[PDB]
Copies of this chain bind each other. A is one copy, B any other.
Amino acid sequence: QACNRAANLARSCWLLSNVYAEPALQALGDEVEDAFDTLTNSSFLDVAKS
């Protein structure tokens, strides 16, 4: 059912490098860019370009 994309599976991970933990509920809100991410967007892309 997971291959068929009608279920999820569970595996261990490393919490490194932008990977965060997932809560058991998952109460989603409207998609929302955070204001701090918009304040720092350009300065962040400059690094990737460099």
Contacts and interface: CB of A to CB of B under 8 A. Distances in A.
A50 interface: no
Nearest to A7: B7
B8 A26 contact: no
8 contacts: A1-B8, A1-B26, A4-B26, A4-B28, A6-B8, A6-B26, A7-B7, A7-B8
Q: Is the interface of A mostly helix, strand, loop or mixed?
A: loop
Interface of A: 1, 4, 6-8, 26, 28
A30 to B, nearest CB: 13
Nearest to A25: B1
A9 to B, nearest CB: 11
